[PDB]
Amino acid sequence: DYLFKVVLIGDSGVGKSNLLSRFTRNEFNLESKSTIGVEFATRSIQVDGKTIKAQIWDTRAITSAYYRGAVGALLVYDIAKHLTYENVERWLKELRDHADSNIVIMLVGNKSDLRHLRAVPTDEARAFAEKNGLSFIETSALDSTNVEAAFQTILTEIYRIV
Amino acid sequence: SWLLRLFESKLFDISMAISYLYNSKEPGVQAYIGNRLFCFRNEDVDFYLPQLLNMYIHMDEDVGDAIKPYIVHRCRQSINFSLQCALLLGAYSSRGTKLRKLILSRLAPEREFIKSLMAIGKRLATLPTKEQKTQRLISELSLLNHKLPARVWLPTAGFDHHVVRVPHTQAVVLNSKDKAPYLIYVEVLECENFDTTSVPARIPENVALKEPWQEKVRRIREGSPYGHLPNWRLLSVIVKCGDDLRQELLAFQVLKQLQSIWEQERVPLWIKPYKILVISADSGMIEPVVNAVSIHQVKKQSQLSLLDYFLQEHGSYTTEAFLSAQRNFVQSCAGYCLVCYLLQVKDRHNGNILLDAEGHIIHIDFGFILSSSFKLTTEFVDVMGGLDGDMFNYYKMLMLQGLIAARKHMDKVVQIVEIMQQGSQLPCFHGSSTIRNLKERFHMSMTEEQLQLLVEQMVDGSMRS
Numbered sequence A: 001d002y003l004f005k006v007v008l009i010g011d012s013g014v015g016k017s018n019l020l021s022r023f024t025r026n027e028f029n030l031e032s033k034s035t036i037g038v039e040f041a042t043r044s045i046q047v048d049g050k051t052i053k054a055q056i057w058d059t060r061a062i063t064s065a066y067y068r069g070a071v072g073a074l075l076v077y078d079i080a081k082h083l084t085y086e087n088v089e090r091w092l093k094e095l096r097d098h099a100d101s102n103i104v105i106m107l108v109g110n111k112s113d114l115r116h117l118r119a120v121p122t123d124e125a126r127a128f129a130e131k132n133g134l135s136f137i138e139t140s141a142l143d144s145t146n147v148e149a150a151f152q153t154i155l156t157e158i159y160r161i162v
Numbered sequence B: 001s002w003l004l005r006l007f008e009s010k011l012f013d014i015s016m017a018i019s020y021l022y023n024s025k026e027p028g029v030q031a032y033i034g035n036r037l038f039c040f041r042n043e044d045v046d047f048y049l050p051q052l053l054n055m056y057i058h059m060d061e062d063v064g065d066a067i068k069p070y071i072v073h074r075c076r077q078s079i080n081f082s083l084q085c086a087l088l089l090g091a092y093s094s095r096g097t098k099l100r101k102l103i104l105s106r107l108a109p110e111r112e113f114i115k116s117l118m119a120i121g122k123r124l125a126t127l128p129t130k131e132q133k134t135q136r137l138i139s140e141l142s143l144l145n146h147k148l149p150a151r152v153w154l155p156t157a158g159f160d161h162h163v164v165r166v167p168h169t170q171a172v173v174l175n176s177k178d179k180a181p182y183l184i185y186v187e188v189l190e191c192e193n194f195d196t197t198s199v200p201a202r203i204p205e206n207v208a209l210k211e212p213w214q215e216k217v218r219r220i221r222e223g224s225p226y227g228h229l230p231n232w233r234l235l236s237v238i239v240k241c242g243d244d245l246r247q248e249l250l251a252f253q254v255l256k257q258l259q260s261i262w263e264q265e266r267v268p269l270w271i272k273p274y275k276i277l278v279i280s281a282d283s284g285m286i287e288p289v290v291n292a293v294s295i296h297q298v299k300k301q302s303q304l305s306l307l308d309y310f311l312q313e314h315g316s317y318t319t320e321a322f323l324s325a326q327r328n329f330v331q332s333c334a335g336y337c338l339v340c341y342l343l344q345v346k347d348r349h350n351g352n353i354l355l356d357a358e359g360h361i362i363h364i365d366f367g368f369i370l371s372s373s374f375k376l377t378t379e380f381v382d383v384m385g386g387l388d389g390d391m392f393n394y395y396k397m398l399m400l401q402g403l404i405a406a407r408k409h410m411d412k413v414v415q416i417v418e419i420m421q422q423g424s425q426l427p428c429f430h431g432s433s434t435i436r437n438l439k440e441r442f443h444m445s446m447t448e449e450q451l452q453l454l455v456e457q458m459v460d461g462s463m464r465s
């Protein structure tokens, strides 16, 4: 029925491709063959009684195809690697240079399963989260936790731009 | 999912974790295992501490960072753990300094205790005879006691504790060499937890001879201020001020693994790993075997042949005490033969083999092993009842059995050695194919009939002299 385009951006290693594989093929793997250039993937869900279809973009040098036609963008960091959270500031200057000024953003801490290796506290993140204009959640791509929730959340939030 | 599948299976143990950590170049796996370390029992992971810490120093930052968090956690809940980390970190680098300094950042009481012990040993260097050294040692140890009970402990001790007293008169120096090692006895009060417990209070002060261990406890106990307490136990350590113990530690792990392997399978070989404590690349401590003395000195005091001494101390060949002692001999011989072959242990003589009161032999000087450059003497064969003997045939049977057992667990052994070679300037890793040669020595390709022959060949070689 409807068509919602969403992009995934973030540092290398944070888990974008497995987020995509969990969410779109319900599959995960520890061994990893690198994504060469670009992917999208698609799956349809329903929000508020309406059949929607979501388009996710998986990211070398950033051509501006990314950030084109995105109603929403999931900006993801690895909770267990502090630097990835640190660069969320640089990922938003990018996103303001190359993307729609009225776009939906979710901050995502991935790899929440690595409890004992955690380098970024949920509070520090959520503080920054509501201090700014981003929605916030923590996911784990390895185990099927909150991956579905994450998408369905951002997708519900989106259709509300009637 | 097939990899993640394995890691979540029952098959996953601390061994496998280290193997993947060591080999895998995938940072997602490295980080994943770093986290999974926490789920394991403290005891199982502890055994591999030298490997882990070695990796941290000499491996990619990615690998270190996955290990560090677990280390810091352990360091924070146990200063003993902290101590052993700090000591190992320093010894294995001559990147390291930062984590070491952070851990030491507290341990001063212990570190001063250890410093003094080392300091003592170095002074005896000016005294050229064994007997002269001992008297200087005894006096200066008495000065330690002046240092109060100090909330310091022997990491070489099985448990957490506080040191209360040093029975200096019982301490003895073991040789006349330039940097001679020396044996001391230490009194301690056992803890339930070191980290939470008050250092005990001083209790005011109001002969050494060849004797069994428990008689020595008796003698020491009756004289000691603290002896009445039930909390009280006696420990012992050998102090080596100028000898590297990093190879010694490696052998220990190998001995410990091989011991478990033969234990896991049901092969009644016998061997005895003795605890090692690395303090520097220079210096270390050893937990000694009690109730044991060198074959060589056993032969100088007895004036007997090895067999004859056995007969004297236990009884004639028709007695149980003898047959038990003979049996303990035979099982310990097969064990150490196998250890000597696999690790290619050299410089084997009766100065390096101890005999305990129950009949086991014990090898001790694990210099000259592997790449760095065992004897069945008739004195040994006689105790076994001779070449045609049933007990001797049994000796050969165990070696094959113990070999078959070893093969079933080869990877656990090679792992210990193969990791340790990392960035190593130790003489035991001198070859191009140290680990490669080691694997060949397990003869994994051979059939059992082939191994029987190889065992036979081994024994024939051990006899030529």
Ligand SMILES: COc1ccc(-c2c(C)nc3c(NCCNC(C)=O)cc(Cl)nn23)cc1S(=O)(=O)N1CCOCC1
Pocket: B174, B181, B182, B212, B213, B238, B240, B248, B274, B286, B287, B288, B289, B290, B291, B292, B293, B351, B364, B365
């Ligand atoms: C690093 O090399 C050693 C390895 C093992 C040992 C040891 C161990 C684990 N247990 C004992 C031991 N047991 C008796 C304890 N007290 C009694 C009688 O009950 C007696 C001796 Cl002399 N040694 N030793 C010592 C040394 S060494 O002190 O550096 N030195 C090496 C050269 O050869 C002489 C010994």
Ligand SMILES: Nc1nc2c(ncn2[C@@H]2O[C@H](COP(=O)(O)OP(=O)(O)OP(O)(O)=S)[C@@H](O)[C@H]2O)c(=O)[nH]1
Pocket: A011, A012, A013, A014, A015, A016, A017, A018, A019, A029, A030, A031, A032, A034, A035, A058, A059, A110, A111, A112, A113, A114, A139, A140, A141, A142, A143, B026, B028, B029, B031, B032
């Ligand atoms: N413990 C844990 N490990 C994860 C998690 N997500 C990914 N890993 C691992 O992180 C590694 C990163 O690979 P990848 O899936 O390509 O992430 P990505 O770099 O963000 O994806 P890309 O946009 O660059 S193609 C994977 O090997 C994967 O096994 C997680 O949620 N928890």
